[PDB]
Design an enzyme around this catalytic site. Structure first.
Site, PDB file in Angstrom:
ATOM      1  N   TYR A  26      35.977  36.697  43.329  1.00  8.23           N
ATOM      2  CA  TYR A  26      37.051  37.363  44.041  1.00  8.23           C
ATOM      3  C   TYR A  26      36.508  38.361  45.048  1.00  8.23           C
ATOM      4  O   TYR A  26      35.392  38.871  44.897  1.00  8.23           O
ATOM      5  CB  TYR A  26      37.990  38.090  43.065  1.00  8.23           C
ATOM      6  N   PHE A  36      36.995  46.303  49.313  1.00 10.25           N
ATOM      7  CA  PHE A  36      36.630  47.418  48.432  1.00 10.25           C
ATOM      8  C   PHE A  36      35.874  46.974  47.162  1.00 10.25           C
ATOM      9  O   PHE A  36      35.331  47.800  46.432  1.00 10.25           O
ATOM     10  CB  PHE A  36      37.849  48.295  48.085  1.00 10.25           C
ATOM     11  N   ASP A  37      35.837  45.667  46.916  1.00  8.72           N
ATOM     12  CA  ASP A  37      35.188  45.113  45.735  1.00  8.72           C
ATOM     13  C   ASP A  37      34.986  43.612  45.954  1.00  8.72           C
ATOM     14  O   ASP A  37      35.825  42.958  46.576  1.00  8.72           O
ATOM     15  CB  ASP A  37      36.080  45.359  44.508  1.00  8.72           C
ATOM     16  N   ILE A  56      44.058  44.784  37.361  1.00  9.84           N
ATOM     17  CA  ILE A  56      45.402  45.187  37.771  1.00  9.84           C
ATOM     18  C   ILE A  56      46.422  44.078  37.506  1.00  9.84           C
ATOM     19  O   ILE A  56      46.088  42.886  37.503  1.00  9.84           O
ATOM     20  CB  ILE A  56      45.461  45.620  39.248  1.00  9.84           C
ATOM     21  N   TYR A  82      47.839  49.765  42.175  1.00  7.27           N
ATOM     22  CA  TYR A  82      47.467  51.136  41.781  1.00  7.27           C
ATOM     23  C   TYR A  82      48.574  52.177  41.965  1.00  7.27           C
ATOM     24  O   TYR A  82      48.355  53.374  41.753  1.00  7.27           O
ATOM     25  CB  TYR A  82      46.176  51.574  42.471  1.00  7.27           C
ATOM     26  N   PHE A  99      43.816  39.962  47.541  1.00  5.21           N
ATOM     27  CA  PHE A  99      42.660  39.442  46.827  1.00  5.21           C
ATOM     28  C   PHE A  99      42.454  37.973  47.187  1.00  5.21           C
ATOM     29  O   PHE A  99      43.396  37.192  47.122  1.00  5.21           O
ATOM     30  CB  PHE A  99      42.874  39.548  45.315  1.00  5.21           C
TER      31      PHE A  99
END
Length: 107
Positions: A26, A36-37, A56, A82, A99
């Site tokens: 992902y 961010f990831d 999440i 979030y 995502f």
């Protein structure tokens, strides 16, 4: 909630079950495409258990709708990401997240 735009189709027979370990690659991004990831950047597929709140809510929900092999873009609204808090330093308040998710295996 979560919207899914398929990038590559899956097999349409193997969907994640409750409690099941899923293996994905992902990339997590803000609504502007800023990463961010990423499990891809780590060169390590990421594992989590459906319905066990290990990621999440929107990520979990989105993956549960995917079949093995499928690659999809998940649009996740803040109430299943979030929320109003966000993640200090990482995710601004009330952030919609995107995502890119590929379902590689189910264990």
């Amino acid at each position: 909630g979560v919207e899914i735009e398929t990038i590559s189709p899956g097999d349409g027979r193997t969907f994640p079950k409750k409690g099941q370990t899923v293996v994905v690659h992902y990339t997590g991004m803000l609504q502007n495409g800023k990463k961010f990831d990423s499990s891809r950047d780590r060169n390590k597929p990421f594992k989590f258990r459906i319905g066990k709140q290990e990621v999440i809510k929107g990520f979990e929900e989105g993956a549960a709708q995917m079949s093995l092999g499928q690659r999809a873009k998940l649009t996740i609204t803040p109430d299943v990401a979030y929320g109003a808090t966000g993640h200090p330093g990482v995710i601004p308040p009330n952030a919609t997240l995107i995502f890119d998710v590929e379902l590689l295996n189910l264990e």
